Amino acid sequence: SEYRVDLVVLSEQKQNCRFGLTFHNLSDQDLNSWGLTFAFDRYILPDSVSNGQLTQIGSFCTLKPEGIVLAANHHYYCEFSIGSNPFRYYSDGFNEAMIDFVVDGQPQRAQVDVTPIVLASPYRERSDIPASLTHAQPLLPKPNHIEVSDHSFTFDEQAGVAIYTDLANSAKAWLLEELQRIHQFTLSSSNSGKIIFKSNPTLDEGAYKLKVSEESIKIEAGSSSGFTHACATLLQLLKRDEATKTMEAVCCSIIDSPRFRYRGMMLDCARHFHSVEQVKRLINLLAHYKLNTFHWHLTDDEGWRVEIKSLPQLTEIGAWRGIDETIEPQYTHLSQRYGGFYTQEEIRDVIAFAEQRGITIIPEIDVPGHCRAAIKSLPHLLIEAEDTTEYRSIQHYNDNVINPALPGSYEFIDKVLEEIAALFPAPYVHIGADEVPNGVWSKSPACQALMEQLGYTDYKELQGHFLRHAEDKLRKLGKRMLGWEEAQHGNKVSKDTVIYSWLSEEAALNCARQGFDVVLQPAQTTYLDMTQDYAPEEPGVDWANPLPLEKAYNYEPLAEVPADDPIRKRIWGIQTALWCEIINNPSRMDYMIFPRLTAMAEACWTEKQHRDWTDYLSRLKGHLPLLDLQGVNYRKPWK
Ligand SMILES: CC(=O)N[C@@H]1[C@@H](O)[C@H](O)[C@@H](CO)O[C@H]1O
Numbered sequence: 083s084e085y086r087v088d089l090v091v092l093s094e095q096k097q098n099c100r101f102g103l104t105f106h107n108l109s110d111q112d113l114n115s116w117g118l119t120f121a122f123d124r125y126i127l128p129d130s131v132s133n134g135q136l137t138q139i140g141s142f143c144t145l146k147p148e149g150i151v152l153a154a155n156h157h158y159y160c161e162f163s164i165g166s167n168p169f170r171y172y173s174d175g176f177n178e179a180m181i182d183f184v185v186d187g188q189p190q191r192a193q194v195d196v197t198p199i200v201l202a203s204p205y206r207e208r209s210d211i212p213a214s215l216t217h218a219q220p221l222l223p224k225p226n227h228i229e230v231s232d233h234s235f236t237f238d239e240q241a242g243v244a245i246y247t248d249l250a251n252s253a254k255a256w257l258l259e260e261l262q263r264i265h266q267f268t269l270s271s272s273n274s275g276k277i278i279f280k281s282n283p284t285l286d287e288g289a290y291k292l293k294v295s296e297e298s299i300k301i302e303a304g305s306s307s308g309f310t311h312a313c314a315t316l317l318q319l320l321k322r323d324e325a326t327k328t329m330e331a332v333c334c335s336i337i338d339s340p341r342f343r344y345r346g347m348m349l350d351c352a353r354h355f356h357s358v359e360q361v362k363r364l365i366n367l368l369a370h371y372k373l374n375t376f377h378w379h380l381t382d383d384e385g386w387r388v389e390i391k392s393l394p395q396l397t398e399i400g401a402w403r404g405i406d407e408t409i410e411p412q413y414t415h416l417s418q419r420y421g422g423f424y425t426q427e428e429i430r431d432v433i434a435f436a437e438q439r440g441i442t443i444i445p446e447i448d449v450p451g452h453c454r455a456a457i458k459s460l461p462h463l464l465i466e467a468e469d470t471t472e473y474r475s476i477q478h479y480n481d482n483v484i485n486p487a488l489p490g491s492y493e494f495i496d497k498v499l500e501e502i503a504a505l506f507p508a509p510y511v512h513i514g515a516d517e518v519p520n521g522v523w524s525k526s527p528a529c530q531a532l533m534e535q536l537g538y539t540d541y542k543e544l545q546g547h548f549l550r551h552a553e554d555k556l557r558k559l560g561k562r563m564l565g566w567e568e569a570q571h572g573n574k575v576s577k578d579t580v581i582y583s584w585l586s587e588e589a590a591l592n593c594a595r596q597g598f599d600v601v602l603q604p605a606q607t608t609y610l611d612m613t614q615d616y617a618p619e620e621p622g623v624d625w626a627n628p629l630p631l632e633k634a635y636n637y638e639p640l641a642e643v644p645a646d647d648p649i650r651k652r653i654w655g656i657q658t659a660l661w662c663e664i665i666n667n668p669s670r671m672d673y674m675i676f677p678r679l680t681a682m683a684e685a686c687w688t689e690k691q692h693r694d695w696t697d698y699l700s701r702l703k704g705h706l707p708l709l710d711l712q713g714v715n716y717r718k719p720w721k
Contacts, residue, residue: 084109085194087120087179091202092161094168100130103145105158105194113152113183118145118194120179121413123623123663125478130163140383140478141177141663142410168203172618173664175199178416191405193417205616209630211699211719219332220704221318222371222680223687224697226341231333235294238328239268242275250279250301252438253309256369257316264711265322267329277301279309288374289339292316294331310440311338311372318370318705342639344601344655345686346375346444347679350662352382352455353413355401355422360668362435364675367714369439371683376436377444377512377657380424383454383475383482384412387423388445392497393460397423400459408458414666426505433507444564445506447498448514450548451475454482456494463490471525483518486548487528495548496555503559510580511561513552515569518545546574553579570598580654584608587639594652603657607637608682610674611661614717621670623663631719635681635695658682669715676709676716677702 086106093100107113121141128136135146147158169175179194219230245254254271261267269277277299282291285304290312293300299316303309315338321330347368349356356364365376380388386400402421403409411420424432436443457464466485474480484491502511523529523541533539536547553563553575564580570593581600583590594600602608605626612629613622622628639656643649658679665671680702684693702719709716 083193083195085181085192086197087118087176087194088197088200089175090200091169094202097165097167098163099166099168100161100163103160103162105152105160107152107154107156107158110154111185112154113181114185115150116147116152116181116183118147118158118179118181119143119416120145120194120196121177121411121416123174123413124164124166125474127163127165130161132161133158134160136162138478139410141412142416169199169201170203170205170616170618170624171613171620171622172198172201173621173623177414177664180416191417201618204618205628207616209615209628209632211631212696213720214696214699214703216704217697217700218704219319219334220701220708221315222698222701222705223684224692224701225315225336225338226689226692227337229335231335233296233333235296235299235331235333236323236328237276237330241269241277242272243269243277243279244273244275245271245279247279247281249281249303249306250309252306252440253303253313254279256310256439257313260313260317260366261320261329264317264708265320265329267322267327279303286339287343288372290315290336292319292334292336292338294319294333294335296333299331307374307440310369311340314370314372318708340372340687341689342653342655342686344375344657345373345683346377346601346655346657347373347682348377348379348603348657348659350379350382350660350665351387351424352379352385353662354666355385355387355420356662356668356671357422358424358428358432360671361424361432363668364671365432365436365441366439367675367679367712369441371680372687373683374440375442375444375657377446377659379446381446381448381455381514382452383477383479384409385421386455386459388429388447388502389423389425390498390501391426392501393494395459396456396498398459400455409455413663426501429505442508443506444508444510444512445502446512446514446564447495447502448516449495449552450484450486450491450514450545451516451518452482452514453484454479457482457484460490460494463494464488466526466528468528469523469526471521471523473519473522473524475519483522484548485523485526485528486544487523487526487532491548492551495552499552499555499559499561503556503561509560509562510564511556512564512582513549513556513569515549515565515574517568518542542572546572549574550576564601567593570596582657590653591643591649594649597652599652599654601654601657602639603659604637607634608656608658609661610658610678610682611663611665614674614678621664622674623661629678631678631681632695634678635684635693635698637681637685638690638693639685641690656682656686672715673717676714677719680705 088104090102282302288307290308291302401423404419567583577597581598584605613620
């Protein structure tokens with residue numbers, strides 16, 4: 083196009099980086115009253131800006147040039163710095179850029195072409211996956227016990243499916259749906275069928291037996307979830323022959339049980355909105371690897387994605403961002419109005435859909451921090467005009483924290499939680515409870531007064547006051563509260579609050595020893611937003627470090643702790659998360675989630691003794707064609 087911006091690393095030192103920004107007017111016309119905006123994920127040092135005035139709100143940066151006019155075929159040059167060790171990835175550059183200018187007194191906008199950043203210090207090393215054989219049974223996760231016989235079972239579309247327990251209804255409907263959707267293979271219910279669902283009360287929750295014989299398949303379970311897990315195994319076990327409307331399973335005996343009770347995946351829908359069809363699609367894929375929990379991250383600074391009828395403004399304002407919108411653009415789509423939200427009717431449809439695959443949905447509503455979208459939506463309710471407190475969040479925001487002294491904050495949170503509790507049948511609600519920015523509420527008159535009333539000597543204690551109100555409210559609504567690990571410090575939440583630990587296993591067990599229930603979600607091994615390889619072209623982020631597939635598989639939760647340890651009562655299970663700062667489409671989403679999710683699924687499900695990297699690679703390789711039939715854009719392990 084007419085306008086191009088080039089970013090170049092000029093200097094690299096310990097915790098410090100300098101950049102050269104060059105903007106080219108390649109149009110024939112001069113630019114008048116011109117200004118540059120771009121998306122950048124790092125905090126730019128404000129006194130470091132050499133040739134213009136920079137304003138930064140989150141990722142959204144506006145640079146006013148010192149020059150009023152930029153001539154045709156001319157260049158504008160600026161330097162800035164950041165406090166950071168070297169950039170390793172092209173995605174560390176500007177995601178998008180654009181300009182504003184005036185022709186004949188009228189405002190104009192143009193998209194700017196952003197050259198890939200010229201990196202000084204890309205990784206030279208590359209993560210190599212060794213060549214692998216293809217395993218005959220590509221089962222992910224690995225069943226804890228499988229015995230394979232020499233024979234095989236071949237069946238046609240008239241084989242029939244028999245069900246002798248109502249517990250298996252959901253699993254049975256799902257199998258048939260998936261065999262139809264994936265393979266176009268139609269099975270029907272037959273009381274005299276070759277595929278049998280049988281009840282076995284001795285089996286624990288989620289456990290199943292699956293035996294393939296020469297002329298029959300028998301599935302046994304004592305729970306709905308068990309039959310669901312069994313059907314996920316059977317989908318991976320079946321091989322469809324072409325030029326014969328037929329399916330083949332190896333004769334085998336499988337006895338299987340889940341290692342952990344909670345096996346979850348969190349999706350960030352606030353940073354970027356993913357449509358109902360996309361969410362459904364992921365949820366069903368989750369069920370394929372025997373995950374039982376979808377954690378829906380619905381609210382954050384960059385968006386509010388859940389319809390609240392009592393507060394229409396949250397989705398009418400807070401679901402949208404753009405230059406013309408109340409909320410500024412972030413990350414991508416700088417030129418347009420970006421957004422979306424889920425209606426309560428759509429959420430009801432997603433809940434029902436998930437339940438058919440044994441998937442519980444946990445909603446997350448972030449307070450008091452990460453609340454920018456809500457605050458812009460309800461200014462009269464949630465803003466104290468007399469607050470002069472200067473603070474910066476970790477995501478470069480100075481105006482994103484709820485005020486625990488305002489009565490409107492309590493009106494807001496009560497109204498939202500009532501509608502969330504009624505909408506979501508799962509007995510859990512996640513409240514955020516992220517650490518507040520340093521010095522927040524420090525110059526708030528309303529907060530100063532509330533400290534004196536409660537006897538608090540430090541402003542951080544207000545956090546606990548707000549969170550305790552949320553917990554008590556959720557308790558009246560019949561919901562247990564869930565929170566991120568910071569909630570455990572102080573007395574901000576009771577022992578009933580479930581803690582999501584991302585720091586370390588040692589911190590998680592510390593928390594468990596205190597009497598909290600906890601979910602392990604370590605940043606270093608379970609964050610699927612992290613890059614998958616060391617090459618600079620790989621999409622993702624790397625602040626927690628690159629996470630290639632081998633590092634993902636080597637994650638082995640609670641390896642050192644014995645099977646009998648009473649602390650394991652406190653460990654709900656494991657979770658993996660996708661943060662969506664730079665994920666705005668299903669192609670990129672697939673690429674990041676797959677194949678690593680299968681490794682996370684195996685960590686969740688399979689006992690450590692049955693885990694092996696080589697064996698895992700061989701099963702992943704035989705599983706790849708099944709993902710291809712579904713059109714999942716997984717990152718290729720062998721390319
Ligand atoms: C609970 C929390 O603070 N989570 C942050 C999330 O906001 C951010 O999107 C992600 C980037 O990878 O870093 C996680 O640690």
